[PDB]
Enzyme design. Sequence first.
Site, mmCIF file in Angstrom:
data_model
loop_
_atom_site.group_PDB
_atom_site.id
_atom_site.type_symbol
_atom_site.label_atom_id
_atom_site.label_comp_id
_atom_site.label_asym_id
_atom_site.label_seq_id
_atom_site.Cartn_x
_atom_site.Cartn_y
_atom_site.Cartn_z
ATOM 1 N N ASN A 43 16.989 59.595 89.862
ATOM 2 C CA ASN A 43 17.803 58.659 89.729
ATOM 3 C C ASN A 43 19.074 59.537 89.179
ATOM 4 N N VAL A 44 19.944 59.577 90.039
ATOM 5 C CA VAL A 44 21.378 60.451 89.707
ATOM 6 C C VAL A 44 22.428 59.430 89.552
ATOM 7 N N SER A 45 22.184 58.057 89.538
ATOM 8 C CA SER A 45 23.096 57.157 89.731
ATOM 9 C C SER A 45 23.223 56.257 88.646
ATOM 10 N N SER A 46 22.767 56.546 87.363
ATOM 11 C CA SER A 46 22.870 55.773 86.219
ATOM 12 C C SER A 46 24.332 55.641 85.834
ATOM 13 N N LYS B 207 18.106 58.048 94.319
ATOM 14 C CA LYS B 207 18.893 56.653 94.164
ATOM 15 C C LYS B 207 20.282 56.983 93.716
ATOM 16 N N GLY C 116 21.800 42.821 94.444
ATOM 17 C CA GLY C 116 22.207 41.316 94.781
ATOM 18 C C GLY C 116 21.243 40.743 95.662
ATOM 19 N N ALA D 250 13.774 49.249 89.681
ATOM 20 C CA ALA D 250 13.622 50.108 88.289
ATOM 21 C C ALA D 250 14.621 49.413 87.304
ATOM 22 N N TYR E 108 15.918 43.036 91.095
ATOM 23 C CA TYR E 108 16.072 42.855 89.564
ATOM 24 C C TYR E 108 16.704 41.716 88.775
ATOM 25 N N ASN F 271 24.846 45.886 82.050
ATOM 26 C CA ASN F 271 23.699 46.480 81.088
ATOM 27 C C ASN F 271 24.425 47.987 80.902
ATOM 28 N N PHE G 181 13.121 47.031 85.079
ATOM 29 C CA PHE G 181 12.571 45.851 84.643
ATOM 30 C C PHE G 181 11.219 46.494 83.714
ATOM 31 N N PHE H 292 18.951 54.605 79.411
ATOM 32 C CA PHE H 292 17.759 55.170 79.354
ATOM 33 C C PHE H 292 16.907 55.285 78.064
ATOM 34 N N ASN I 59 22.021 51.431 93.010
ATOM 35 C CA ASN I 59 22.146 51.217 91.554
ATOM 36 C C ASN I 59 22.984 50.381 91.246
ATOM 37 N N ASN J 48 25.060 54.996 82.786
ATOM 38 C CA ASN J 48 25.111 54.970 81.565
ATOM 39 C C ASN J 48 24.558 56.334 80.698
ATOM 40 N N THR J 49 24.838 57.524 81.426
ATOM 41 C CA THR J 49 24.443 58.682 80.881
ATOM 42 C C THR J 49 25.733 59.607 81.434
HETATM 43 C C1 LIG Z 1 18.822 45.676 82.874
HETATM 44 C C2 LIG Z 1 19.176 46.624 83.950
HETATM 45 C C3 LIG Z 1 18.350 47.732 83.819
HETATM 46 C C4 LIG Z 1 18.238 48.759 84.716
HETATM 47 N N1 LIG Z 1 17.530 49.905 84.528
HETATM 48 C C5 LIG Z 1 17.519 50.867 85.574
HETATM 49 C C6 LIG Z 1 16.767 51.988 85.370
HETATM 50 O O1 LIG Z 1 16.566 52.495 84.189
HETATM 51 N N2 LIG Z 1 16.933 53.007 86.436
HETATM 52 C C7 LIG Z 1 17.279 52.622 87.771
HETATM 53 O O2 LIG Z 1 17.118 53.453 88.531
HETATM 54 N N3 LIG Z 1 17.981 51.394 87.671
HETATM 55 C C8 LIG Z 1 17.923 50.597 86.964
HETATM 56 N N4 LIG Z 1 18.497 49.484 87.148
HETATM 57 C C9 LIG Z 1 19.169 49.321 88.163
HETATM 58 C C10 LIG Z 1 18.318 48.337 89.409
HETATM 59 O O3 LIG Z 1 17.215 49.228 89.528
HETATM 60 C C11 LIG Z 1 18.975 47.974 90.702
HETATM 61 O O4 LIG Z 1 19.488 49.070 91.301
HETATM 62 C C12 LIG Z 1 20.183 47.220 90.498
HETATM 63 O O5 LIG Z 1 20.117 46.147 89.349
HETATM 64 C C13 LIG Z 1 20.695 46.235 91.751
HETATM 65 O O6 LIG Z 1 19.616 45.365 91.888
HETATM 66 P P1 LIG Z 1 20.002 43.804 91.288
HETATM 67 O O7 LIG Z 1 21.166 43.114 91.755
HETATM 68 O O8 LIG Z 1 18.653 43.215 92.069
HETATM 69 O O9 LIG Z 1 19.737 43.813 89.723
HETATM 70 C C14 LIG Z 1 18.636 48.422 86.076
HETATM 71 C C15 LIG Z 1 19.120 47.081 86.081
HETATM 72 C C16 LIG Z 1 19.318 46.222 85.363
HETATM 73 C C17 LIG Z 1 20.000 44.923 85.553
HETATM 74 O O1 LIG Z 2 12.145 39.113 84.230
HETATM 75 C C1 LIG Z 2 13.073 38.202 83.426
HETATM 76 N N1 LIG Z 2 13.978 38.695 82.958
HETATM 77 C C2 LIG Z 2 14.434 37.852 82.251
HETATM 78 N N2 LIG Z 2 15.463 38.129 81.370
HETATM 79 C C3 LIG Z 2 16.348 39.369 81.632
HETATM 80 C C4 LIG Z 2 15.830 40.685 81.875
HETATM 81 C C5 LIG Z 2 16.352 41.867 81.990
HETATM 82 C C6 LIG Z 2 17.678 41.796 81.790
HETATM 83 C C7 LIG Z 2 18.433 40.816 81.267
HETATM 84 C C8 LIG Z 2 17.646 39.601 81.332
HETATM 85 C C9 LIG Z 2 18.368 38.274 80.988
HETATM 86 O O2 LIG Z 2 17.686 37.111 80.801
HETATM 87 O O3 LIG Z 2 19.666 38.422 80.673
HETATM 88 S S1 LIG Z 2 13.484 36.465 82.367
HETATM 89 C C10 LIG Z 2 12.441 36.986 83.010
HETATM 90 C C11 LIG Z 2 11.403 36.528 84.070
HETATM 91 C C12 LIG Z 2 10.557 35.437 83.655
HETATM 92 C C13 LIG Z 2 11.556 34.252 83.194
HETATM 93 C C14 LIG Z 2 10.729 33.028 82.560
HETATM 94 C C15 LIG Z 2 9.206 33.223 82.632
HETATM 95 C C16 LIG Z 2 8.640 34.295 83.006
HETATM 96 C C17 LIG Z 2 7.080 34.426 82.934
HETATM 97 C C18 LIG Z 2 6.449 35.405 83.139
HETATM 98 C C19 LIG Z 2 7.123 36.495 83.579
HETATM 99 C C20 LIG Z 2 8.516 36.560 83.885
HETATM 100 C C21 LIG Z 2 9.060 35.462 83.442
HETATM 101 O O1 LIG Z 3 19.201 52.773 81.532
HETATM 102 C C1 LIG Z 3 20.394 52.192 82.143
HETATM 103 O O2 LIG Z 3 21.311 51.886 81.493
HETATM 104 C C2 LIG Z 3 20.482 52.031 83.525
HETATM 105 C C3 LIG Z 3 19.825 53.215 84.277
HETATM 106 C C4 LIG Z 3 20.238 52.975 85.598
HETATM 107 O O3 LIG Z 3 19.815 53.708 86.623
HETATM 108 N N1 LIG Z 3 20.914 51.798 86.177
HETATM 109 C C5 LIG Z 3 21.451 50.726 85.029
HETATM 110 O O4 LIG Z 3 21.980 49.846 85.571
HETATM 111 N N2 LIG Z 3 21.120 51.087 83.908
#
Ligand SMILES: Cc1cc2nc3c(=O)[nH]c(=O)nc-3n(C[C@H](O)[C@H](O)[C@H](O)COP(=O)(O)O)c2cc1C
Ligand SMILES: O=C1N=C(Nc2ccccc2C(=O)O)[SH]=C1Cc1cccc2ccccc12
Ligand SMILES: O=C(O)c1cc(=O)[nH]c(=O)[nH]1
Length: 365
Positions: free
Chosen positions: A181-184, A224, A304, A65, A325, A114, A67, A118, A253, A186-187
């Site tokens: 989702n009770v683990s954000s 979550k 990670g 979630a 993510y 981040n 993305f 929400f 999260n 940011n709220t």
């Molecule tokens: C920019 C960003 C926005 C996110 N928004 C949400 C969200 O709206 N809801 C949620 O449950 N998790 C959110 N996450 C958390 C991801 O779902 C994930 O739990 C977390 O980033 C760990 O996975 P990763 O290290 O592969 O990023 C967000 C993460 C990032 C980096």
């Molecule tokens: O998923 C992506 N996210 C990107 N940036 C981010 C997205 C969420 C939060 C922080 C970032 C960041 O760049 O910091 S860049 C990308 C994926 C990607 C990169 C390059 C070409 C693409 C073409 C099609 C789809 C995804 C692409």
């Molecule tokens: O929307 C956000 O700021 C957010 C939500 C969430 O569940 N996790 C996170 O890392 N950011």
Amino acid sequence: TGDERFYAEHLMPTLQGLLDPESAHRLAVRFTSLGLLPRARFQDSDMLEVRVLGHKFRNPVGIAAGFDKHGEAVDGLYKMGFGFVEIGSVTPKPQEGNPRPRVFRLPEDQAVINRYGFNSHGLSVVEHRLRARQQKQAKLTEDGLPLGVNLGKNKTSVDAAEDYAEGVRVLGPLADYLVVNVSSPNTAGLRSLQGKAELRRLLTKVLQERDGLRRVHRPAVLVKIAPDLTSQDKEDIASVVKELGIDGLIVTNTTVSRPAGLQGALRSETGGLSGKPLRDLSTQTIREMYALTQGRVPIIGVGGVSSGQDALEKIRAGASLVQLYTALTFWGPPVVGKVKRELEALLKEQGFGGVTDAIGADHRR
Ligand SMILES: Cc1cc2nc3c(=O)[nH]c(=O)nc-3n(C[C@H](O)[C@H](O)[C@H](O)COP(=O)(O)O)c2cc1C
Ligand SMILES: O=C1N=C(Nc2ccccc2C(=O)O)[SH]=C1Cc1cccc2ccccc12
Ligand SMILES: O=C(O)c1cc(=O)[nH]c(=O)[nH]1
């Protein structure tokens, strides 16, 4: 492969040099929603198949979630190679989230912080969007590519369980699985919904709404959790999860902690930390939860993951599925096929017939 190498060393550093993280995300979503990618070379083998949550998952690597917050790029993401897709978090009413900037690269740490808060098109916009491809999705699900929908609460909401119930009613019918989702991080007070008595009240209610839906329209319900829970919190969650019959857990999260060793300039920005520094912390939370639930509650491991080994560690720790993510932001779409290809090799190397055999394997040593 030449894509993995081209994106990791050329395309990705050049996109990072040009755009801020939020802009980069907005564009990736747009590019993905439109189809603009290769389509993954990699054919999924039968080793990678998993049956869990009342569905078949063609491969166990999903997109987490955050993305695709508003269900705009789902199809593009299946195309990208993910074996399941989770959207959200979605709040009942639209809301903008926090002011910019609200997302930050820690490239030395392979991490992201981040604090979006929400930002959401809200239920009813997302509802129409999913309704428009509902049937395309029913065939995708039948084919092993399910859809999850992750629910949040509005900032100004006076009744948190009610926000979630609304969510269940409006999007539950369109989801293979819903996430509470009770683990954000940011709220305000959202993470305290993770405490026992509050968790039991909220989930009782969610599960009621869920049971009220028609059988074909009735999703599994997961919860979550943060990676920052005390031992008590975890014991309590495990307990309530068994008491109520919650279908699964997503773990984890982002972390509000800041592990020793972070190098990034922006390491002291408020927000949840994701990516490499979160990895082992979240793997360990997967471990503790699997053990406390006796291996009878499916877990989606997240935090990670960037390589087959990352994934397989989470699976062996007890995850039935995993998500990433942050890795996608450093390495681009090839990371998806990379993770699968390696996971498959590693499974052969350690003599697992398939992913299902590896689930929890560490706890049986
Ligand atoms: C920019 C960003 C926005 C996110 N928004 C949400 C969200 O709206 N809801 C949620 O449950 N998790 C959110 N996450 C958390 C991801 O779902 C994930 O739990 C977390 O980033 C760990 O996975 P990763 O290290 O592969 O990023 C967000 C993460 C990032 C980096
Ligand atoms: O998923 C992506 N996210 C990107 N940036 C981010 C997205 C969420 C939060 C922080 C970032 C960041 O760049 O910091 S860049 C990308 C994926 C990607 C990169 C390059 C070409 C693409 C073409 C099609 C789809 C995804 C692409
Ligand atoms: O929307 C956000 O700021 C957010 C939500 C969430 O569940 N996790 C996170 O890392 N950011």
